[PDB]
Write a protein that binds this DNA or RNA. Sequence first.
RNA 1: AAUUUCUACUAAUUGUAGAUGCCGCUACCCCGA
DNA 2: TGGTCGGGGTAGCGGCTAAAGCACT
DNA 3: AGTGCTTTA
Length: 1113
Amino acid sequence: YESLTKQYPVSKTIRNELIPIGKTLDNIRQNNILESDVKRKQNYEHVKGILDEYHKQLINEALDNCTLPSLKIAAEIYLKNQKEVSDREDFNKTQDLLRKEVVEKLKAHENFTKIGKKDILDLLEKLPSISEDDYNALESFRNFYTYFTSYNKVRENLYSDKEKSSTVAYRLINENFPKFLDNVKSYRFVKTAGILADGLGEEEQDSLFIVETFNKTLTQDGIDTYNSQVGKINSSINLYNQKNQKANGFRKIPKMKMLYKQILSDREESFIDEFQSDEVLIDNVESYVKNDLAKTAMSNIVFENWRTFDDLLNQEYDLANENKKKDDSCNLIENYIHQISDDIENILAKNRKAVKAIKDFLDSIKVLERELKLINSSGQELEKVELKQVDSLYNMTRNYLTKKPFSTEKVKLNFNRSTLLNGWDRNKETDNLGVLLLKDGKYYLGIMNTSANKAFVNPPVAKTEKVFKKVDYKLLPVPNQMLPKVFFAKSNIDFYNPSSEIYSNYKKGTHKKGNMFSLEDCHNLIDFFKESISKHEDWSKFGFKFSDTASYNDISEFYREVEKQGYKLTYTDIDETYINDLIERNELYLFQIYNKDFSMYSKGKLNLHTLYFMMLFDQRNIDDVVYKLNGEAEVFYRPASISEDELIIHKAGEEIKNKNPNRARTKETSTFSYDIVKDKRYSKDKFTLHIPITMNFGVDEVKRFNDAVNSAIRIDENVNVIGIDRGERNLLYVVVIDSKGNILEQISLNSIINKEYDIETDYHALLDEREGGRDKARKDWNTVENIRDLKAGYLSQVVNVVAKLVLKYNAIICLEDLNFGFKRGRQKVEKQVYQKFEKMLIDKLNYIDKSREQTSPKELGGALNALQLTSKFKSFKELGKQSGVIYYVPAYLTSKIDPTTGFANLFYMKCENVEKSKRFFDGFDFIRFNALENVFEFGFDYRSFTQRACGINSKWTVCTNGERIIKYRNPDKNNMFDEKVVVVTDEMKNLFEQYKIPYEDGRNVKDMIISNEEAEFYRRLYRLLQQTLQMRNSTSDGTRDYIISPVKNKREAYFNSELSDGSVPKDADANGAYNIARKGLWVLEQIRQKSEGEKINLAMTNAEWLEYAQTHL
RNA sequence: AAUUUCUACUAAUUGUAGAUGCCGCUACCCCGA
DNA sequence: TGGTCGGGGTAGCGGCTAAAGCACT
DNA sequence: AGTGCTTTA
């Protein structure tokens, strides 16, 4: 499995730590960044609600009020069967948004705001603010490096693929017209809204047949006009919705109309305009006739009852009168809350009034909205008026904590250079302000001061032999763009004439995508590029070796060859004393980096991320196709969190005890030094970096899952398979196997152990009893352990275990499916944390690394070339397919039950009627009894059962022997139950003695039982019949294992889990893991059966699975 | 009870063993004061 | 069941982005 | 005769 190595350009962002070195307090202000007092954020009442609010004008004065409304502009049946046979993929385009130029009509108006042109947001005041304590008019701050592609322009594509299901400006026309073709295929006499709308009497629209400018719902008036009034009238009326019949209540949750949820620009942008008095203004100042009704209590300020008159009317018949469920008219029991919305006869009429009296008044109308319940004004009036137009902006007034990660109004400050760190190339040394440097071992970092940026352009040669080595590099970005950018600029055209024919060819674009042309002229263009780069000196410093003239790289291949060669790092000696001589002038912000790892006596193994950063500048290695520093690397300061006083800590003499068993025993004193210990990471200030990384830079191929597995598929080196399962006693018991089902491991991941350190961790009961502690402590207050953080850490540790197993035994991972599977079901892990375990196991299997103090990195797990075992995942919808080396198989009717009979659920369902029970018995061949082993054995054949193709060969004779510890129900003493049957046999000898039947003849005693008729007799016979087959034991507290299949496995084995043999699963969930492994080997055989890049589906049928499980020997 | 970040660690020790894309685009969900 | 406020996550939704003209004071 | 840069490409 030596393929799959650096076969996908993965990328990461190392998050390292900074500490200064030298003086490192350069500036007179002592900030060293000058992001130390922004002051733009405290008392933000002047500025709040300006930019994002005037986005409302920016959208309103640009969108097209009168679009091309006609759905019939396509002029097409679509698909009603009244058309020609030849579709020719045109009808699906008619379903699709085949129009193009409505965006062109949208963008007709540039639409700058009343307050200011873009220049007010682009002119550099070079200040954090201009506003004042009294008021502000055109407040702004400096530009901060390309807001355009990032913050505000994302809102300006509404008919596009923005990947959010609310900007519904074209999915409405995409969906409603197919729905109307359905509504004319069938007719609307099944829906309730056609006539429940006692008035309008329509499902959605005033007249459903006609088209309409549905974007009226998108604007300020919102979906209230579309929905809210008929929502209000929807109540206990229409008793046939509450009294079933052929229609008008065809389902319990119909709600037959909906326009899809409010657009991104809605729930947003309350009312305010450019005025010379400022307000925080979270509330509707224009007009709050809105009422988000929530109709339970009226006059709750001055009534104090959650239901107004229901509280007054009665208190006994609220529960004394029987509920509606068993005793089914809704209009007499629930119509109270529908007639409760008695409308207020009048229209607190108030606006933002008293702010001018003193400088500080904040929230008048917000307090009015808070204290007053919704105004009960904008009702319904039995017909769907523009009532409740301003719920859409009260929806800004509420939930304002939810929507605001980043607009352009709140970007953070940094060094006095917007482009900080955008590129650390040779030529851009002067402007990008960044410089890399390092001594031996300690990795330094330099940032030039703004005053003397050009001071570093002249490094004098070495004088003293105290080096302070400095690193620089050189590259060539985006060669699709730089190559046409250079040699076609008007300046370089003057400095070097190109041929007019080639310029004409490129301007018309003969050589671009989608054309047949003279390949010799394409070669002429390529030569023009090559020789005009030969003209250069800065570009010519690169060792560029492009292709040959016999057949040159295509233009995409040309840019690939340009990009992959274009990166070279080097270094030059610098006098340390000279750095000391210059830093006095406050001209260079120096830094250096370390963490837990960089310390020689700290011999312990490295963190994985300090290995990458350390090996990045491994100057002895070229790092040609290995990690390359790239892109912006913005820094981040945080302040100190917790004080030393709050750090409660013992002084010298802290011989405290160990929490762990087997180390609280051996070393209870906890021998230690007296550098007394505590988490210090929050005890001080901090500086942090982000270094983007393109691990496996320059790799020339992105591939797929079949590509990411088929190399293993031809020649195996992987045949083993990991099983995974969960259960009660073991949380996540795992089982690996071999090709032919030989179990090779039985380790419970409840227990893990540091083998190299070779001291037992006793992880069992540090897992199960600790999560039990969380279970019994989380009910009343938020425990220290989050509800899933311990599971996250445990699964994180398990990733190392499974990765080591994969690399040791060659085994491939075969986690259970959760799509072809049916239920959600009772589970040991509640919210499908197993799903994010799949995600984590993919995410790490993108790349184990040793991460030790010294390395010889030329290895598969040597941190140079990490094996990319699985390609990246896209979606859980994409899951259910083989994610590289993480296959999936279903898990249903086999997670608990061995397949030897498998009828844990009885082959028939439970019997109630006496004659049906008799018929159910009559399929049996013989019910018998032998007093030797006391076995009251039975007999039956497969063919006489429902679903007579599900199983295969149910001719086995279910026996009855051995004890069972089954979970009785004997609720006499408040849900008591007998913990066991004494033995499964002999509990019905008394039942036979009730009739005194000759049960020792060897006859089919059934012949008498059909003649016997007693309800309790057959009820108890049912209980013992289901219980003798209950082959999994309900393990007690202080668990005991008994996997006891009544059918013999040819040797009276019963797969008895009390035994010690390895092939026998030790526990029930271990047997389930074994079953998942046996499905895993089958799906691997299914894959091997194929012989092309095409692969059959991963799924299984229950019949086929039961067939193979029967034929597992 | 030590970190750069998270779980758990004491683990010969101002540390141990294993894991992680930071800013960022706005959305859904699912049950609930 | 449209009835209102969540409430915290879930999943598919920018990244893994760096030189050169060019209009510049 | 020009440094900031938003532009491109």
